[PDB]
Amino acid sequence: IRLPAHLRLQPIYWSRDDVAQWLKWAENEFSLSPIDSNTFEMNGKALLLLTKEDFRYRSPHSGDELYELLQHILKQRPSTSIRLPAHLRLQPIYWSRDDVAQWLKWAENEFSLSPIDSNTFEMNGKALLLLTKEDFRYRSPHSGDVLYELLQHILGGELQRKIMEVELSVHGVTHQEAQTALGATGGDVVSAIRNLKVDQLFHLSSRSRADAWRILEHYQWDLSAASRYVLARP
């Protein structure tokens, strides 16, 4: 897989124009049927969000190859994140109709997409979570699949945000144990953290777990403070 000097940056940093150069490079390298340059009117960040089914739909003849070729480029050398603006930090479950519209305007420049008419999703965030991927495709044939997968990553980073708040709340907890503790509380970060702090303080005291629950509640969840009292008690 010998890519040209201008396509040797990681695909995540490809511009819209880079994507088009990569398509013309691929069709001549593998004798693929010619594809239209506008079939992937997006930058590298959006390209990496597409599924393999999205590639098949956009290109019925060379989509499969294109996707696998993209994966062979990703295996060559290695974290893309969604830099959400401050007004789009509320979870989509609480998005308004105007929040969805700003989300579309932000997405268009962030992924170098074709213009998305504001009227494409005349709805609040609560209705957006019920739309299927095919509804996204219908409403925006140029970018609907990107927009759907973008929404899924926003919904997934909230859970990972919660896992990190748990593990980094007390030392000694692995990333898996935090996710395990978070699922036991049904997603309650505050309860998962409280359970971890009670367990660590219970391990250091010869007293009951309920006694460890009240000491922490008094010390306002300062495990170090509550550990100092327990350690001094005989």
91: nearest Cα among 146, 184, 149, 157: 157
CB atoms within 10 A of CB 14: 23
CA distance 107 to 87: 13
The structure tokens listed for 60 are 């019925």
CA distance 170 to 186: 19
CA distance 43 to 14: 6
CA distance 72 to 55: 15
CA distance 81 to 45: 9
The structure's method of determination equals X-ray
CB neighbour burial string for 17-42, b if at least 16 within 10 angstroms, e if fewer? ebbbbbbeebbeeeebeebeeebbbb
The fold for domain 5-76 equals DNA polymerase; domain 1 (1.10.150)
Max CA pair span of the chain: 80
CA distance 116 to 113: 8
Query: Is 5-76's fold the same as 86-163's?
Result: yes
CA distance 147 to 135: 11
CA distance 136 to 152: 12
DSSP H helical ranges for the chain: 16-29, 44-47, 52-58, 63-76, 97-110, 125-128, 133-139, 144-167, 175-184, 189-204, 209-218, 223-232
Domain ranges, ordered by start, for the chain: 5-76, 86-163, 168-232
26: nearest Cα among 50, 52, 54, 61: 61
- The CATH number, out of the four listed (1.20.210.10, 3.40.50.1820, 3.40.50.2020, 1.10.150.50), of the domain defined by the range 86-163: 1.10.150.50
CA distance 133 to 20: 25
3-state SS, residue 199: helix
